[PDB]
Amino acid sequence: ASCWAQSQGYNCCNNPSSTKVEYTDASGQWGVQNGQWCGIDYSYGQ
Numbered sequence: 001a002s003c004w005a006q007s008q009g010y011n012c013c014n015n016p017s018s019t020k021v022e023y024t025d026a027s028g029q030w031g032v033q034n035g036q037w038c039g040i041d042y043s044y045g046q
Helices: none
Strands: 022-027 028-035 036-040
Touching: 022 036
Parallel strands: none
Antiparallel strands: 022 028, 028 036
16 A cells, blocks of 8 residues: 555655644545645555
8 A cells, every 4th residue: 555645646754753643534634734634654665
């Protein structure tokens, strides 16, 4: 698995293990950065 937000078309938070989540939906949890939504995922490595 990986960036799950991708299924919808959102970006991905760099290093999600240290990105305070500001979002929270059926897509898991997300983080806000640069004023843009990114998908926070543990399998997000690439």
